[PDB]
Structure formats: structure tokens, C-alpha cells
Amino acid sequence: FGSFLVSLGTSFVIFVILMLLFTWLSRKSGNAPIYYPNRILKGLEPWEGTSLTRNPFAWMREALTSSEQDVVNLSGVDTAVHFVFLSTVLGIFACSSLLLLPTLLPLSMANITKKSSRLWAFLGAVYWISLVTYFFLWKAYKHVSSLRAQALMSADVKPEQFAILVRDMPAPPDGQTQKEFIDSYFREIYPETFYRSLVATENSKVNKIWEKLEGYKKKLARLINESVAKLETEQKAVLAEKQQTAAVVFFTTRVAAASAAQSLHCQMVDKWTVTEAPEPRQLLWQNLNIKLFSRIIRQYFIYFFVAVTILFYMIPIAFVSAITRTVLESFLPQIALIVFLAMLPKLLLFLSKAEGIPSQSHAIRAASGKYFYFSVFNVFIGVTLAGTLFNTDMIINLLATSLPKSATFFLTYVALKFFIGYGLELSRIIPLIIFHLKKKYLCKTEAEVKEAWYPGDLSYATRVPGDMLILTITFCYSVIAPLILIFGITYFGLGWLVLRNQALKVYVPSYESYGEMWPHIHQEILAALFLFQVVMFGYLGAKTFFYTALVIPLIITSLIFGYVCRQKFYGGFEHTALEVACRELKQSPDLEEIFRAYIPH
């Protein structure tokens, strides 16, 4: 039945890996090992060495032996955190080796015939999974916190440390504009440890003017005067009589800034909401000018709209996905779901960043959260509706919820995410074709680097939640059908390998976010596990033997584990600690460069 999809996937990997080995060992090396030219050559060869050292395949080199500190040397701590996430999920699904050999051995109903056929073994399996996940999650969480501390205390001096973002503000002083109002206020509150302070202004007439002028200047190759005059005029205009509500404030020592940010500032929380100032390149200067009601009103309207769009996908798209010479009919709904769900990281990110989230490093996280809500209800409603439209007592319901939906769609969809997916991702075939087309067609006149050259960040906004849909669809069916357990374990293995290659050779991070997005990942893994435990409570209950009173303990255990983890480690993921603040770097920093690092245009 579904074997055609796996065959197509393995053929696609054969093709794309053939293309990789045929193309990377060539003069296209400016593309496939892209992270090395920038950050001057360290992989500018099909090795880190001379003498025709191609030897395909060449991942017996550092690709497999990538020191956990080597990666954080060659990429931000964010990359190392993502790797520990991949490794931990691989660990959970691998340490479940004493669930695939025993529980699959119990092979006219085809599944267990609703009669005591060691359903106790199923309870054993659910305990084993719910136990190994706890163990690995704890270990990994300690490890990530240790990485964050280690790279946070030895980091160089960066302008994100001497600053806070004072998001809200009582606008009127009634006789003076806002710059001197901030001056008076923070001077009263923080004497002699307070350097200077930008006041967030408007980006319209000019910010767009600067963008257009930059475009015009870029056009110069082998008019502008009016543009630069307008720039000067609107620039002088904006730095006066606009002086919006929010602002950003710089302190003279690393200790005092990290002390202020975690603090409070007026005995009515709805005014002067200081917060650890984000990194310069992700400050998101658009959403500052929002009071504390507007954030909440916007947020609840956004959640209502997310619920509405959840329904507007789950009716028609799940109907279409419940569809199942027929081989084309077997392939079609796969890519149909890929297009119906491959959109909407973008709409979620737009919608979320419109909730006033004042930093890209948090907009990405919020979009990932909303996407996880989409994913869970994808699994739930998709399988339920597929089973129902498959059928027309409860035993029939059990048979339909177990075998068809999983064994066809959930088994093969991951295969559409691995072989064809990671296969396309590693070769970077389509970036290769677009780059070469850019070279032949209209180029940037030797500004090819300032052209289709620059890789994005690893985009930990479609790679995180995208590679968690299958984590959920894996935990949920982990003991229903260990076949997807083998599929998920091989998925995360291939993902670790190919993504280590890409992180070491091609990708270049944009922001830093030293360690965040891990507690989010942890809470999300835990939520997947909790949903798994509830679903096995349900299915085993449908199997009419009452070890459900034995399964409830795991539900309580997951809730309590969440509480203890969030309270015993996840308070260190919101602030640089005062100790680390005192030991960030002490070599006489100058505030002037820092201050020049937040001028927006």
C-alpha cells in the first residue's frame, strides 16, 4: 500500500546524495561550505586540508566528530542548544530499545484482541517511556543550563549587556518633552550610574526613505541628491516632536544594568516596565510604542483568531487528508498537507510579532508555541476524523484509531520529512540552482557576496516546530505501533547528521539568544509526553482492562515534573546573573560605541 512512498523517498535521497557528492567536490565550494569564506576560510576545501582531500564521503571528518564546544566556537550557543535537543529526542527514542523488541513480539483482530493479551505489557511500555523521557529531560536540562552559564560568563563585551528596554512610559510631562523627562526620572532613581538614553522614535517617513536611498546607492554600478536631502530633513524632524513612549537606557557598569532589568520601577506596574534589553539586531523597533493594555487586548484578539484559523484548517484540510492506478492518489495528499501546513509559520510569526513582542528572539518562540498548538490538534483531529470517515461498537473504533491512520499517513509523512526533506535540505540543490542562475543572469557586479551568497540563520522557527510535529506524532503512537518508533529514531539520527554538517559548514546565525528557546523546547517535549500518557490512558481503557488506575500516576508525575523543573532550573533562563554580570568582561568598556550600536537607521 504505502510502500510506494518509502520507495520514492529512498530514490529521492539516492538522487540528491549523488548530486551532493558530485557537486560539493568542485568549484561550487563557495556555496556548499558557505560558513567558511565569511569568518575567513576554515572549511574552504572538501576538508580542512590540502592535497586534493576530497575523499567522498567526507563526514568521517569533524562532521561526525564535532565537539560540543567546537560547534559553539563555530556558531552561537543557540546552535549547540538545538543540537542538544536533537540528541535528547534521539536518546529518548533510542533508549526505547526495550520496547520495540518485546512489545512488538505480541503479533480476527490483528492488533491485541481486547482480551488481557499482556496489555500489562503495554502499561509496562508506557511507564518505560514516561520514565526514560524524565531521565533524559533532566540530564539535558542540566546540560543546557551549564552551557548557558559557561558561554555566558566567558562572552566578550557586547552592547546588549549595558542596557535595558523601558517598554512603557507615562507620556506627558506637560512642560517638557520626553528626553528630559527620562533624564530627570532615571537620574533621581540611578544617580551617577546612568550614562545616556535613546528614546524610541518613529519609523516611517524616514525609515523607508533610508531603505529607498540605500537601494538607490546600491544601483550605482559600472537623483540621489534629492533623496539624501529628504533624508536629512526627515531625520532632523524625527529626532524632535515625535519622541514616542518607550525608550532604551544604558548604565555605566554591567552589574547595574543586569540589576535594573530584573527589577521593578514604579509602584503601579502599568508604567515604566523595564526589561532586559534585547540584542541590537533583534530589538524590533516597531512594537515598542504600546501601553500595557494594548499588549493584552491585542494578545487575546490574536489567540481568538488563532483558534478560528485552527478550525478553518481542521475542517477542510483534515477532510482532504482523510482521503486515505491509485499510487498518484497516495502521493497527492502528502504534498497537499505539506503545502497546507508549510505555510503558516509565516502567518503565525507575523501575527505574533504584531502582539507587541519586543524582540525577534521572542517572536520566533511565540510563533513556535502557536505552531505546536496547531500540531497537537493536527494529530488529534486528523486521526480521529480519518478513523471516523473510515468506519461509517468501540472495538471497531479501536481498530480504526490504531492501524490505518498511523500505519499509512503517520508512518509515511515522516518519510516525506526525512528522505525527501532532509535530502533536499543537505544538498542545498535549490539554493545552488538559484545562485548559479543569479550569476548567469543579472548579477550584483562582483557583489555576489552581497547577493545570493548569504545563508540565513538555521531558522530556528521552522526547524524547531517542524521537527516537533513528528516528535508528537511519534510519542503518541509510540506503543500503538513501534514501527513509527523506528521511523522517528532514524529521522532524528539523519537530522543530527545532516544538520551538524549544515551548522559546521553553511549556516550562519543572525541573533544570539545565548540559551533561550530551550525551556520552551523542554516544556513542549513534556507536553508531548503528557498528551502521550493521556492518549494511552484512553486507548488502554478502550481495551477494556483497568490498568487505567495504574496509568493515572504518570499523568500526575508529568504535571509534578513540570512544576519541579520550571522551578528548579528555568529561572536561570531569563537573566544574566549578577555574578556573571560582574565577570562578563572587565577591560574598561567605552559607552560611546555601545550607544552608537543602537541608533536604528
- Answer yes or no whether residue 293 interacts with its own copies by CB under 8 A: yes
Question: Is 332 an interacting residue with respect to its own copies (CB under 8 A)?
Answer: no
Question: Interior CA angle at 286 toward 227 and 166, to 5°?
Answer: 125
Burial 8-46 (b: 16+ CB within 10 A, else e): bbeebbeebbebbeebbbeeebebbbbbbbeeeeebebb
CA distance 191 to 534: 56
If binding is defined by CB under 8 A, does position 127 make contact with its own copies? no
DSSP string, 54-69: --SS--TTTTTS--HH
Distance (Å, rounded) from C-alpha 348 to C-alpha 370?
7
Interface map 186-225 toward its own copies (x if CB under 8 A): --xxx-----------------------------------
Q: 3-24 vs 420-427: helix axis angle to the nearest 10?
A: 10
Which helix (H) or strand (E) covers residue 82, if one does? helix 77-95
557 belongs to the binding site for its own copies (CB under 8 A): no
Instruction: Output the smallest distance, CB 39 to its own copies, in A.
Output: 28
Q: Do residues 554 and 127 make contact, with C-beta atoms less than 8 angstroms apart?
A: yes
For the record, the C-alpha cell of 436 comes out as 548559479
Contact between 300 and its own copies by CB under 8 A: the answer reads: yes
Binding track over 67-106 against its own copies, x by CB under 8 A: ----------------------------------------
Contact between 459 and 349 under an 8 Å Cβ cutoff? The reply is: no
Nearest to 374 by CA among 320, 305, 307: 307
343 sits in the region (left: phi over 0; alpha: psi -120 to 50; else beta) called beta
Residue 394 found at the interface with its own copies (CB under 8 A): no
CA distance 35 to 503: 8
Q: Note whether 170 binds its own copies by CB under 8 A.
A: no
Complex with its own copies: residue 3 or 263, whichever CB lies closer: 263
- Candidates 262-270, 336-344, 487-495, 539-547: pick the segment binding its own copies (CB under 8 A): 262-270
Nearer to its own copies, 111 or 299 (CB): 299
Q: Which of 574, 586, 592, 593 binds its own copies (CB under 8 A)?
A: 574
Question: Cα-flanking dihedrals φ and ψ of residue 364, to 5°?
Answer: -60, -45
Looking only at residues 136 through 165 of this chain, which bind its own copies when binding is defined by CB under 8 A? 145, 148-149, 152-153
x-or-dash pattern for its own copies, window 580-599, by CB under 8 A?
Answer: x-xx----------------
Binding mask 503-542 for its own copies (x = CB under 8 A): ----------------------------------------
Residue 430 is a binding residue for its own copies (CB under 8 A)? no
Work out whether 184 is an interface residue with its own copies (CB under 8 A).
no
Is residue 292 a contact point for its own copies (CB under 8 A)?
yes
262, 286, 459, 462: which one contacts its own copies (CB under 8 A)?
262
Binding site for its own copies (CB under 8 A): 145, 148-149, 152-153, 188-190, 255, 258-260, 262-270, 272, 292-293, 296, 300, 560, 563-564, 567-572, 574-580, 582-583
